[PDB]
Amino acid sequence: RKYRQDKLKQAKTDAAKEIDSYKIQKDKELKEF
Amino acid sequence: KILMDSTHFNEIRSIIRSRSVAWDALARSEELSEIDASTAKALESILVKKVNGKTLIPLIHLLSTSDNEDCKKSVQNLIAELLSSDKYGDDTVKFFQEDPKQLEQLFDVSLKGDFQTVLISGFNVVSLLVQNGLHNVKLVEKLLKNNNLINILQNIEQMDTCYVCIRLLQELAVIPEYRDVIWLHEKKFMPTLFKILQRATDHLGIQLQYHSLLLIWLLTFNPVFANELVQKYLSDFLDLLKLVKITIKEKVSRLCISIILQCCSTRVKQHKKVIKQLLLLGNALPTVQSLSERKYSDEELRQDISNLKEILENEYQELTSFDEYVAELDSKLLCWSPPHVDNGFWSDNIDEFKKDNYKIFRQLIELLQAKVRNGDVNAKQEKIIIQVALNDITHVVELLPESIDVLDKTGGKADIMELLNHSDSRVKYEALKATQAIIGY
Amino acid sequence: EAEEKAKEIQLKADQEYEIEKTNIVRNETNNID
Fold first, then answer.
1. How far apart are CA B278 and CA B415, in angstroms?
2. Where are the domains of chain B?
3. For residue B384, which of B374, B398, B396 has the smallest C-alpha distance?
4. Residues of C in contact with A30 (CB under 8 A)
């Protein structure tokens, strides 16, 4: 349970950072249009 | 099954296996084909005691053809045993995922036929839907909408069926679409959850209560669902706190604490308002303080209790005695609160009571009139509320005498006179004291 | 199988934490737009 609990903190940070980059990529497409 | 390790699931499987019909007997009675009978016998040998594999379709066809209750129960028991078995069950789930017709047939079989057969088929469908590939929100919603599932959930006497249904809902709550389906089912059948919570606050029952609490927490994980359920039952938080205090199980207490925190979590809408309302009505701050003083073996439960106590203290820091009095007046419940017997509180709240054209005085007069109307019952709680209202009226007449005319216009004097003839000695004494404060010595 | 269930329950909490990370994407998306 502890091993998966530690992965929750990593998931809460890795996914959020990756999603933020995806949003920035979407902004680039809007700027190009 | 998905949760076949549970005692209720094992009992349901045993009940389903009790009504067993031989494949050869079904074939003789024209209820199945020779190939279908052979496939059913192979599946029975593999699971009930060789795996049917692709032959599971002939077994399902034979089960559909054999409309007899015993044959349906035997088929459901065989399906449940295959799902429990490691070698079997997974192949059926993969086939259902690859072929939606098989998944649709399994969903239709779920919550159908005999009660034991319906439970076994529902467990098999849940086990099949546990896999990501075979997961289907529509199938789960259709199974939940079935009358058999609703009857099992609402079966107070049949605690095993309710526990199995709650466990299945909690297991299905992992998938966000199935989580929304479970939230809709909870919105539809909140009465069963409320009854389970009340029974827990006041074994098979313990397991059912734990499963219901887990399902409630899973639903409240989504902020929208938690916000919707917050207004569904204002006393739900109080009932959960009472159940947590009564129950000594660490897991149940931790689940209740998590559910309570989710409702007051910042993710849910109106988190501050919900926390303030919970603290004012259900006395969340005192219960949390009592829980913090008590020692809990579980570390996670202790941390959750500490977080809840900190949240309650933060909410109560902004709140004051005036907010508690307003909440008590709105709820029309008064049990001789410390503010009623505090002279300083009455002195510092006299202006507030007379504020807004004596809105608080008018509310107190209306509450007293309602208690007088309810005085025929003369319940102990009703008598205490009437006495508290009479004391508040006497205080609001002694201080800020302008409110006396408003009370007389609103029939407060008539209500006091009627209460003076009440059978209860305490109510009569309170009415006499109010009359003395009005015009007496 | 009791230990595996606890790990699976903790694994579900990791997915919930990932869902919490996905919630932060909405806040980040509004800034890019």
1. 32
2. 1-320, 332-441
3. B374
4. 33
* Residue B50 amino acid letter: K
- The answer to whether B85 and B46 have CB atoms below 8 angstroms apart is yes
Residues of B in contact with C15 (CB under 8 A): 174
The coordinates were experimentally obtained by cryo-EM
User: Cα–chain-centroid distance for residue B122?
Assistant: 22
- Residue B225 at interface with chain C, using a CB cutoff of 8 Å: no
How far is the C-alpha of B155 from the C-alpha of B325, rounded, in Å? 40
Check: CB of residue B165 under 8 Å from CB of residue B149. yes
H helix intervals, chain C: 2-32
B221 touches chain C (CB under 8 A): yes
Nearest alpha carbon to residue B105 among B130, B125, B86: B125
End-to-end CA distance of chain B: 78
CB burial class (10 A; 0-12, 13-18, 19+) of residue C29? middle
Residue whose C-alpha is closest to residue B48's, from B84, B2, B12, B90: B84
Q: What is the 3-state secondary structure (H, E, C) of chain B?
A: CCCCCCHHHHHHHHHHHHCCCCHHHHHHCCCCCHHHHHHHHHHHHHHHCCCCHHHHHHHHHHHHHCCCHHHHHHHHHHHHHHHHCCCCCHHHHHHHHHCHHHHHHHHHHCCCCCHHHHHHHHHHHHHHHHCCCCCCHHHHHHHHHCHHHHHHHHCCCCHHHHHHHHHHHHHHCCCHHHHHHHHHHHHHCHHHHHHHHHHHHCCHHHHHHHHHHHHHHHHHHCHHHHHHHHHHCCCHHHHHHHHHHHCCCHHHHHHHHHHHHHHHCCCCCCHHHHHHHHHHHCCHHHHHHHHHHCCCCCHHHHHHHHHHHHHHHHHHHHCCHHHHHHHHHHHCCCCCCHHHHCHHHHHHHHHHHHHHHHHHHHHHHHHHHHHHHHHHCCCHHHHHHHHHHHHHHHHHHHCCCHHHHHHHHCCHHHHHHHHHCCCCHHHHHHHHHHHHHHCCC
- A21 — contact with chain C (CB < 8 Å)? no
Are B316 and B366 in contact by the 8 Å Cβ rule? The answer is no
- Give the nearest partner residue to A5 out of C10, C25, C32, using CB atoms: C10
Task: Give chain A's radius of gyration (CA, Å).
Answer: 14
Are C25 and A22 in contact (CB < 8 Å)? yes
Q: Which of B131, B148, B111, B116 is CA-nearest to residue B10?
A: B116
B221:C12 CB<8 A: no
Handedness of CA C27, B308, B166, B296 (dihedral sign): positive
In angstroms, the CA B104 to CA B97 distance is: 10
Closest CB from C10, C21, C29 relative to A12: C21
- Can you give the resolution of this entry in Å? 3.3
Question: Is the separation of the CB atoms in B182 and B172 below 8 Å?
Answer: yes
